[PDB]
Design a protein around this ligand. Structure first.
Ligand code: PLP
Ligand code: PLP
Lengths: 396, 396
């Protein structure tokens, strides 16, 4: 039944790792990773989540099943992080949050729910976007379409092409928005554009799906949700797949949320019964440990203050190398002007390199990066900086 | 898009819990739960997994993503538990194990893989079986069929009806077998029947899917896998969805495995690339904590010996109340003879009651049970025994 021919193909970024370890040579630099790294190259456990883990060891007395939608505490800590404390959405009981395995886990649950209970047939994702978005949505029977976003040239958001392209969408189409700037480009909407897009969607009938995975890495936790909240003000129904992998550095514990908002509490509960039916048929109920850590910190004033200092250090560190890479590039020769790197938010950026400068950089220079030219600046440190900017000047 | 009409319906066992807490009265007894409970009514964390959790707090230094198929250690600890140490299957590199979120998580992954990469269209599950089996398989586009198993009368396995019914299956049909006896009935195959069914399947062309969730609760870890191994000897390809929820009492950490075996290593790796493609499009990669606890204990001789003493206490405790319930039923009046309860393995058993003796037992007697008459004997203790056997004699 399986013997002879089934198939393959390698993940874009995930197969690039098995030639990082294999290289002998001194220099070897991996940008092209997807996690954060500190000035010494490690992805440490946060001081704050180690404290909440000692709390959980001493306090937990059972390991019994969680409800299908998880830990209540977690759900409202999420709603308050995504929307704010005083939001018409929370006091009006318009939102329901399922605790889910990672942000990908939340998108597959948005997907199965939508594919099975709704009339939705296409979702519109940006070009470029995170490659695993097509697979999650195609696995739920939905085909994916693309709306312009960058193209390239000016190194910015091509606002008029995204809209002239978004007009080809009909009214029960989902359009997926990145809340916290864009993987792979780091490019925003400005608040005035998020407002210009929230009205459009209200008038054309799109149903927005915000993918929000890097909240806290652009200007701060609150400022990073103003796009979302600018749409949550205008919408009756919306969906958000949030993740706590990159901000609680809780990557392998699989900690995410799928929030559904619906117009009123009676509707959102009927809808959320089917979202819970979807989940029951996938993994049955969510992993407790990581969500138990996120809810213990977010509800403890001491702990939550150490976490926020730790998110501000990561955030400040990435900003530093955006600032420092574009400077070392100037004082190391540098052909092209890279000023665009600064205010392009978060960990990833398109270096601008061709799919030939990347392979020249990788075969015999030791710098790794994704062939699309996407680099992770959190893979950059101060004493690996000038070996890296030198290698890049060598190829233009 | 969601406002007005979507839908509902309640889970068989999972909705029965919200009227357990709501009852004031003294007596209130919940059988109809799905977890183990000790002689005092609690589902404690195992001594052994608390020790492995202190080890993990002191030792882990990162929380970075696991590969798609998880922790290597976990995978071979599983292969050695499912198949034995010296198995042609392991030394010949014929099996690949993905670490998965719970046993349900492994079945949805068997399902998506099969539905998308294979010609499989129907799977045959027993009547009765675990109700969430139809949903997992239907969500993957597969319809479910049923093979006779119990019907009722003799209170045993109706061997000839299951086979006369299994002949209506064609050759790329999956037939799902419960390895460790049967949810909901606790009824086996004997080893001589598992051998009689392994040949049948080899000759008709079925592809077996073993669901193995209660390994260690019938006679012991090894004896409980002899059905599986009696088929793994005869088969070229097979699938098993194993779970560590009920034996490591690790319920909410979501710890399971999906093992694929294929005829040779080159095939099973091609097949397992697509199984990993399936997983990537669902939750991306599995939760680390619980699997990290299972692999730390199974690879430590001290620790693994405390765990096995703890699995033998649970196993001995359930046997005790099977023994004691059928005795208190004799000395408390008792109409019918309940001798069938003993050697009917594990936690659940069909009490034999009608869907009217259950509702009489629940509305004004305080004993809870699933309407199908399924009881959890681990919900039975020594000083709740004679209140419960008394209530049952009262209704016949
Ligand atoms: C990382 C990421 C996710 C999901 O991350 P998890 O590791 O599953 O929490 C979702 N969307 C985008 C755009 C991401 O970058
Ligand atoms: C409990 C059970 C499972 C899966 O359990 P998890 O809680 O997800 O580990 C699968 N099959 C049967 C027959 C079960 O009883």
């Amino acid at each position: 039944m399986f013997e002879n021919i089934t198939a393959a193909p390698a993940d874009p970024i995930l197969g690039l790792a098995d030639l990082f370890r294999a290289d002998e040579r001194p220099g070897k630099i991996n940008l092209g990773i997807g996690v954060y790294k500190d000035e010494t190259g490690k992805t440490p456990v946060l001081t704050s989540v180690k404290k909440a883990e000692q709390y959980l060891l001493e306090n937990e007395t059972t390991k019994n099943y969680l409800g299908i939608d998880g830990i209540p505490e977690f759900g409202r800590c999420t709603q308050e992080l995504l929307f704010g404390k005083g939001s018409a959405l929370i006091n009006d009981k318009r939102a329901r949050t399922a605790q889910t395995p990672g942000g990908t886990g939340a998108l597959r649950v948005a997907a199965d729910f939508l594919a099975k209970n709704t009339s939705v047939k296409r979702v519109w994702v940006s070009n470029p976007s995170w490659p695993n978005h097509k697979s999650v949505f195609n696995s739920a029977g939905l085909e994916v379409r693309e709306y312009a976003y960058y193209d390239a040239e000016n190194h910015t958001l091509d606002f008029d092409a995204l809209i002239n392209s978004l007009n080809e969408a009909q009214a029960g189409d989902v359009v997926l928005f990145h809340g916290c700037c864009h993987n792979p480009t780091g490019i925003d909407p400005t608040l005035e554009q998020w407002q210009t897009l929230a009205q459009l969607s209200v008038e054309k009938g799109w149903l927005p799906l915000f993918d929000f995975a890097y909240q806290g890495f652009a200007r701060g936790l609150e400022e990073d949700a103003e796009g979302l909240r600018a749409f949550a003000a205008m919408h009756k129904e919306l969906i958000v797949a949030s993740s706590y992998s990159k901000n609680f550095g809780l990557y392998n514990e699989r900690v995410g949320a799928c929030t559904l908002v619906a117009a009123d509490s009676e509707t959102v509960d009927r809808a959320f019964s089917q979202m819970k039916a979807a989940i029951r048929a996938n993994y049955s109920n969510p992993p407790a440990h990581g969500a138990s850590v996120v809810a213990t910190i977010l509800s403890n004033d001491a702990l939550r203050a150490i976490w926020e200092q730790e998110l501000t250090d990561m955030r400040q560190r990435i900003q530093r190398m955006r600032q420092l890479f574009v400077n070392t590039l100037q004082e190391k020769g540098a052909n092209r002007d890279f000023s665009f790197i600064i205010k392009q938010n978060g960990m990833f950026s398109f270096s601008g390199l061709t799919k030939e400068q990347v392979l020249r950089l990788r075969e015999e220079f030791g710098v790794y990066a994704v062939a699309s030219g996407r680099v992770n600046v959190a893979g950059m440190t101060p004493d690996n900086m000038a070996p890296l900017c030198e290698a890049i000047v060598a190829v233009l």
